[PDB]
Amino acid sequence: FTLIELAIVIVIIGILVAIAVPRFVDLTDQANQANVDATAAAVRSAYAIATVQAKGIPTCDQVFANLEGGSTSGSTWTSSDNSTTVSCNASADTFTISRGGKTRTLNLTVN
Amino acid sequence: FTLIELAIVIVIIGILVAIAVPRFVDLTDQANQANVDATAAAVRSAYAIATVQAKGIPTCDQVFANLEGGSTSGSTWTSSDNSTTVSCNASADTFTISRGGKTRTLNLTVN
Amino acid sequence: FTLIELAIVIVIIGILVAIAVPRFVDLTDQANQANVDATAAAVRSAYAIATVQAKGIPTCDQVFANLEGGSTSGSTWTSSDNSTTVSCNASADTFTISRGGKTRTLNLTVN
Amino acid sequence: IPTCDQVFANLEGGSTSGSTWTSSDNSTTVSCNASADTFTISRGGKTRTLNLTVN
């Protein structure tokens, strides 16, 4: 390369640097909260559907039977990507929904 | 970097900019209205259930006992995320449901 | 940005596009039908309650006195969001319930 | 269902003249055919079509 071309390069490098560039940000807290909230809405609907199926107060299993996005092991349901959990305390008439420390609780009577 | 690579970069930057990009929009008015409406539906059902429990006209507390998503302090119920409110005027036979300035009123006889 | 970063961006844009995305659909016909049907159920109950209050065949006004979700101007009742209408033809012993072109008719004797 | 103008109101990088939006550097175009429930996006002969119901 000629000295002129190198001089031009030395100029242009200095100008294509000293742009702004975005930071990466750990937005997983906000996303986890929305996941927990959307899951809580789904649990309420799944419970409501279960009260028709049960013709009365539903069992914990009847509620989780109506959730699509995951699998269940006795008294708990887990999203297929394992981070979101739902669980009953059937004696405490309560569902807890949680993901990455974000959490929500539904006080729905269940057996 | 060579001058050719910088020239190519100067071209491509100018083309990956001058896309469209969406505006963020404060859609909280539309969402607040839907929250107030969904809550109003819940209050009507909670009231209807309360008329069976009460075997007659229900008390303001008997109505709020049938709402899941929050807590009550005398004559008012508040969503667990505190922005949605329901309140009785038991002398005025009225429930008011409100959130972020969006509001609805139910004229249900209560004591 | 380097040419490599722009190349990576050109690849990833092409893959985050060419997802599926849902269509918006005007489901207002199905929702309007359900509104008309739910309102028709309410009119039947309001009429039945009115036959006890009247100790006989009720007046058109005695029937609408038992409906919560709206207001009345002589011989018609309108939802507080004005789109759903109920009206008597007291000479034709008929109530018509309608919303957005969806309609239902109840042949209940009234005066 | 939104109008063609309500859709373009939400795009930042350009301007609109009835039924079309154009990037501020004028080469990228978007246009509605509101009767055909379609948006066409194009630039320098490269093109894409979205079948979204609009009025």
Ligand SMILES: *[C@H]1O[C@H](CO)[C@H](O)[C@H](O[C@H]2O[C@H](CO)[C@H](O)[C@H](O[C@H]3O[C@H](CO)[C@@H](O[C@]4(C(=O)O)C[C@H](O)[C@H](NC(C)=N)[C@H]([C@@H](NC(C)=O)[C@H](C)O)O4)[C@H](O)[C@@H]3O)[C@H]2NC(C)=O)[C@H]1NC(C)=O
């Ligand atoms: C929901 O299903 C999913 C998959 O479908 C998953 O498997 C979940 O976990 C379970 O998975 C297995 C069963 O399918 C595990 O074995 C386990 O079962 C649980 O139940 C066992 C029998 O009730 C229990 O065993 C005990 C016992 O039999 O008494 C309880 C104690 O561990 C006990 N130990 C002591 C010291 N008291 C013995 C123990 N003995 C000794 C000396 O250590 C055994 C014989 O070694 O075992 C299991 O311990 C277990 O609770 C279960 N996973 C767990 C919790 O490990 C399934 N349900 C859920 C949500 O757990």
Ligand SMILES: *[C@H]1O[C@H](CO)[C@H](O)[C@H](O[C@H]2O[C@H](CO)[C@H](O)[C@H](O[C@H]3O[C@H](CO)[C@@H](O[C@]4(C(=O)O)C[C@H](O)[C@H](NC(C)=N)[C@H]([C@@H](NC(C)=O)[C@H](C)O)O4)[C@H](O)[C@@H]3O)[C@H]2NC(C)=O)[C@H]1NC(C)=O
């Ligand atoms: C519903 O429950 C939730 C939580 O479960 C929440 O706590 C709500 O608010 C209340 O919370 C506390 C009680 O649990 C507060 O103390 C408060 O109580 C209300 O009732 C008090 C007694 O009736 C009342 O006190 C008065 C009084 O005793 O007369 C009323 C006046 O304030 C009065 N002042 C004057 C000048 N007349 C006195 C006052 N005196 C002076 C000289 O200032 C006191 C002695 O300092 O107090 C309280 O004022 C209060 O109304 C209540 N929160 C509020 C409203 O602050 C609970 N209910 C709801 C919805 O409020």
Ligand SMILES: *[C@H]1O[C@H](CO)[C@H](O)[C@H](O[C@H]2O[C@H](CO)[C@H](O)[C@H](O[C@H]3O[C@H](CO)[C@@H](O[C@]4(C(=O)O)C[C@H](O)[C@H](NC(C)=N)[C@H]([C@@H](NC(C)=O)[C@H](C)O)O4)[C@H](O)[C@@H]3O)[C@H]2NC(C)=O)[C@H]1NC(C)=O
């Ligand atoms: C139910 O209540 C709600 C609110 O509570 C709502 O107001 C409804 O609509 C009514 O609202 C007003 C009354 O509160 C309106 O004035 C109107 O009243 C109706 O009754 C009037 C008197 O009976 C009637 O006026 C007439 C008349 O007096 O004869 C009838 C004719 O219009 C007549 N015109 C002619 C050419 N014959 C005259 C007219 N004269 C001329 C030369 O034009 C007048 C003097 O200008 O008026 C009204 O016309 C009206 O029917 C009523 N709203 C309407 C229908 O406009 C209330 N009831 C319902 C459901 O309507």
Ligand SMILES: *[C@H]1O[C@H](CO)[C@H](O)[C@H](O[C@H]2O[C@H](CO)[C@H](O)[C@H](O[C@H]3O[C@H](CO)[C@@H](O[C@]4(C(=O)O)C[C@H](O)[C@H](NC(C)=N)[C@H]([C@@H](NC(C)=O)[C@H](C)O)O4)[C@H](O)[C@@H]3O)[C@H]2NC(C)=O)[C@H]1NC(C)=O
């Ligand atoms: C979107 O906005 C941007 C800027 O905000 C841009 O301006 C776009 O282009 C338009 O810009 C002007 C209007 O703001 C132009 O005038 C033009 O307007 C269009 O509408 C005119 C009236 O509807 C139209 O005129 C007509 C007519 O009035 O009938 C249609 C024919 O041209 C007609 N000719 C004949 C032979 N039938 C007459 C013509 N008569 C003769 C004898 O020639 C006139 C009187 O000379 O004119 C215009 O022709 C035009 O369509 C519009 N730019 C264009 C298309 O030229 C704006 N909208 C878009 C996207 O176009």
Ligand SMILES: [Mg+2]
């Ligand atoms: Mg139980």
Ligand SMILES: [Mg+2]
């Ligand atoms: Mg009372």
Ligand SMILES: [Mg+2]
């Ligand atoms: Mg009659």
Ligand SMILES: [Mg+2]
């Ligand atoms: Mg159309």
